[PDB]
Amino acid sequence: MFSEQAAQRAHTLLSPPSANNATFARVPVATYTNSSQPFRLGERSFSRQYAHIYATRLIQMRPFLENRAQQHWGSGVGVKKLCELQPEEKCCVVGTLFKAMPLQPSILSKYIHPDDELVLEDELQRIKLKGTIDVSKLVTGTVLAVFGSVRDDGKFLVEDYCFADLAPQKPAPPLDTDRFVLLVSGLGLGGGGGESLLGTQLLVDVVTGQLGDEGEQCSAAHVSRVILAGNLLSHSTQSASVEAVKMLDEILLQLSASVPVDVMPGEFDPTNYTLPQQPLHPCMFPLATAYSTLQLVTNPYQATIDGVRFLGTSGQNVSDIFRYSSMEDHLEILEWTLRVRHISPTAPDTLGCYPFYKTDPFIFPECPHVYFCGNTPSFGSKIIRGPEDQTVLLVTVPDFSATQTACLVNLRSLACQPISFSGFGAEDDDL
Amino acid sequence: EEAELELLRQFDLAWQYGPCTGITRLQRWCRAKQMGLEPPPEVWQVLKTHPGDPRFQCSLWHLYPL
Amino acid sequence: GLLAFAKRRNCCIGCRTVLSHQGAVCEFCQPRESELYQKEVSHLNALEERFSRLWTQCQRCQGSLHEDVICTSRDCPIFYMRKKVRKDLEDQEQLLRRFGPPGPEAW
Amino acid sequence: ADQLYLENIDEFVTDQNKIVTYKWLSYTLGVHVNQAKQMLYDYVERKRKENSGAQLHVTYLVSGSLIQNGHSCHKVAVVREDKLEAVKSKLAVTASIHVYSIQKAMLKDSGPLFNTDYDILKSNLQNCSKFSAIQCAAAVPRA
Numbered sequence: 001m002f003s004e005q006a007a008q009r010a011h012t013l014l015s016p017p018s019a020n021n022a023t024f025a026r027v028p029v030a031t032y033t034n035s036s037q038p039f040r041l042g043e044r045s046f047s048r049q050y051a052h053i054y055a056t057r058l059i060q061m062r063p064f065l066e067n068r069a070q071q072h073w074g075s076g077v078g079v080k081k082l083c084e085l086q087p088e089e090k091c092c093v094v095g096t097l098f099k100a101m102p103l104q105p106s107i108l109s110k111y112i113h114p115d116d117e118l119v120l121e122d123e124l125q126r127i128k129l130k131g132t133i134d135v136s137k138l139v140t141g142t143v144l145a146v147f148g149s150v151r152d153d154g155k156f157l158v159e160d161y162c163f164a165d166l167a168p169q170k171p172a173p174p175l176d177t178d179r180f181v182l183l184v185s186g187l188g189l190g191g192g193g194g195e196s197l198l199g200t201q202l203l204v205d206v207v208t209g210q211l212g213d214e215g216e217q218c219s220a221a222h223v224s225r226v227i228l229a230g231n232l233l234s235h236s237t238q239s240a241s242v243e244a245v246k247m248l249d250e251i252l253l254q255l256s257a258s259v260p261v262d263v264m265p266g267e268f269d270p271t272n273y274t275l276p277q278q279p280l281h282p283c284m285f286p287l288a289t290a291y292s293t294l295q296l297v298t299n300p301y302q303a304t305i306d307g308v309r310f311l312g313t314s315g316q317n318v319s320d321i322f323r324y325s326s327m328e329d330h331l332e333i334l335e336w337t338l339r340v341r342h343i344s345p346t347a348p349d350t351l352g353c354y355p356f357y358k359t360d361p362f363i364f365p366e367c368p369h370v371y372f373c374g375n376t377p378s379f380g381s382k383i384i385r386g387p388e389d390q391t392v393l394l395v396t397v398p399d400f401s402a403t404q405t406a407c408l409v410n411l412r413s414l415a416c417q418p419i420s421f422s423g424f425g426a427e428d429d430d431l
Numbered sequence: 432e433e434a435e436l437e438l439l440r441q442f443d444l445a446w447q448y449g450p451c452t453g454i455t456r457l458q459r460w461c462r463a464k465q466m467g468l469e470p471p472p473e474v475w476q477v478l479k480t481h482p483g484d485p486r487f488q489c490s491l492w493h494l495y496p497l
Numbered sequence: 498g499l500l501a502f503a504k505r506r507n508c509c510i511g512c513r514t515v516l517s518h519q520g521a522v523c524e525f526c527q528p529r530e531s532e533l534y535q536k537e538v539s540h541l542n543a544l545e546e547r548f549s550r551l552w553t554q555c556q557r558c559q560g561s562l563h564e565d566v567i568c569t570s571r572d573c574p575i576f577y578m579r580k581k582v583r584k585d586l587e588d589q590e591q592l593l594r595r596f597g598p599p600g601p602e603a604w
Numbered sequence: 605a606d607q608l609y610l611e612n613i614d615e616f617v618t619d620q621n622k623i624v625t626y627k628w629l630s631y632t633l634g635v636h637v638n639q640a641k642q643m644l645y646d647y648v649e650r651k652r653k654e655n656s657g658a659q660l661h662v663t664y665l666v667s668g669s670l671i672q673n674g675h676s677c678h679k680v681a682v683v684r685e686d687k688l689e690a691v692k693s694k695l696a697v698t699a700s701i702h703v704y705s706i707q708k709a710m711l712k713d714s715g716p717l718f719n720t721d722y723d724i725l726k727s728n729l730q731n732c733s734k735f736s737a738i739q740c741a742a743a744v745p746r747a
């Protein structure tokens with residue numbers, strides 16, 4: 001990929017001065033299209049209630065689950081509404097989960113408890129559930145189909161159940177010369193060390209073209225874009241924040257000089273709290289708004305970068321699922337989120353969102369080629385396949401303040417390589 | 432009138448068009464038409480032969496501090 | 498009687514001086530505007546977090562997640578504490594539209 | 605020619621008792637970055653061949669590929685003067701070697717090497733792509 005090509009030449013720099021030194025040029029970004037328009041909210045009227053969201057979620061997700069239960073259990077179909085069930089008869093039900101957990105805090109670290117019930121709910125009534133089903137892997141808000149019978153105590157006995165699955169995916173055109181994309185998250189400007197300072201300096205010095213030989217300068221010239229994904233100012237306590245936006249403005253100036261940059265709000269960043277987070281206001285960045293290479297986005301970000309389509313968050317859905325479930329692997333939680341056809345199924349019950357009423361926008365309408373996450377504690381990447389011809393690369397971006405690691409994504413081979421930065425510390429090997 | 436005020440009160444409580452006590456009446460009529468559940472072409476034909484009257488173009492409980 | 502004939506007199510967010518035009522900042526207190534935007538968006542952020550914890554608690558006290566809430570229980574603190582945050586949010590959202598929009602929306 | 609920057613470095617280092625990175629010695633003398641690294645290597649080679657016992661400390665940079673557990677990572681490190689060859693033998697592929705800094709009296713960690721670059725950036729803010737090896741085209745002040 002990158003470090004293979006970075007040694008492909010001769011080395012000139014352990015030498016006395018010369019007449020000329022080589023220069024290069026940044027590769028063109030001749031196609032780009034932002035398609036994150038359902039997350040940019042222009043009107044923003046509150047004063048509705050959260051019942052309009054669940055109803056449109058069920059009404060939109062129902063035909064997918066009917067069409068999958070047909071070909072997953074046989075076209076001798078027995079799909080039936082929750083009220084028209086007769087005692088001890090084999091049928092399929094399509095509904096919404098609700099997990100009834102105590103230890104979840106009310107108004108007046110994991111939170112799973114050894115006893116907690118699942119309830120299948122439709123628009124008119126509910127029913128309890130027991131049998132062969134996982135009690136702690138599933139969360140409230142997933143829509144699914146299920147197979148079984150109504151027993152004598154009013155409960156329901158489950159044999160097997162199925163999720164919605166992956167959406168269709170059109171193929172991408174192949175590329176001629178490999179272009180790279182760099183992904184960073186969580187610089188933590190405001191607190192978090194001094195080795196993080198030299199790490200941030202060495203990272204911007206490599207990507208801008210100040211560091212290393214003609215190998216590194218030829219290979220960093222091919223990096224086409226830069227994406228910064230959330231949690232730019234890590235905060236120690238709210239009640240500091242004014243002096244940090246000055247330094248963030250300086251860093252975005254030093255990056256806006258050479259590359260195009262995309263900046264996203266995170267868990268602590270001066271924006272709203274609900275989930276389609278709106279872009280940062282330009283009045284906090286005097287210096288960096290001189291150039292038209294800096295762009296400010298928000299939370300759920302879609303794009304079409306050179307044919308390859310991207311979609312990502314700053315890691316607020318994945319940690320929310322991590323709170324109220326039993327899965328630990330963040331790459332697995334990201335793939336599970338992909339499997340139920342919903343970016344954030346736990347919303348709104350433990351993760352706040354805007355009260356939409358026309359259409360729920362967190363249902364996947366297509367399949368992305370790349371799908372990344374936000375502030376995960378360690379690097380990971382994987383390739384997964386669909387039932388049809390659908391392949392997806394899954395990346396979890398590490399957190400720069402502890403690991404000092406970023407990710408390079410190739411746009412022609414579609415692979416991801418880590419990059420790590422480490423200056424020497426107070427290290428003396430004679431003690 | 433007095434027969435048109437029960438048709439709208441019947442459209443407002445049918446559960447197969449949505450859970451609607453936060454929005455207008457014509458917005459819920461167009462929401463169901465987009466998804467095309469089965470809006471009937473009579474709850475439209477009284478919301479056109481009237482102006483902006485608050486006892487036609489409003490949900491049943493548009494008072495009521497809920 | 499006279500209370501209805503308000504002229505919607507706007508005021509500077511920094512030093513409280515009534516003046517003609519709709520801009521939020523005063524001409525003497527214009528340099529410190531990034532700090533005055535920074536201040537009060539951490540208030541909108543904390544009102545947003547209080548709207549959502551309350552209006553979904555009624556859904557769990559009611560039983561259902563798919564139908565409307567009707568409970569005007571005068572002995573519940575939940576009622577009329579869920580009514581005032583709508584207006585706090587209504588007011589604090591409109592104070593930040595004094596500042597322009599952070600981008601376009603018709604693209 | 606040579607005596608110009610040789611005497612400039614000999615008064616910056618040993619008289620004013622300062623810490624000279626390559627970016628400071630390229631913002632002082634108005635030089636390209638790679639030529640500044642070559643200048644520093646010239647000075648250290650001359651004064652280390654002359655005497656062998658100077659009050660001179662160096663710090664280098666080593667970059668290149670590695671495999672920890674299967675995966676190919678790319679490790680970049682700013683290294684002292686004792687531990688260079690072991691770090692060079694741990695790596696798989698080598699991709700960049702030059703010089704980073706010189707000193708008079710030995711430091712304890714990588715503290716002031718950020719203070720120097722930060723302060724010389726602080727006053728020199730309208731140019732950072734001026735001596736950069738990569739010159740993009742669409743980034744010119746417009747808005």
Ligand code: SF4
Nearest residue numbers: 555558568573575576
């Ligand atoms: S207002 Fe209070 S009592 Fe009424 S449903 Fe809400 S939480 Fe329950």
Ligand SMILES: [Zn+2]
Nearest residue numbers: 509512523526
């Ligand atoms: Zn003022």
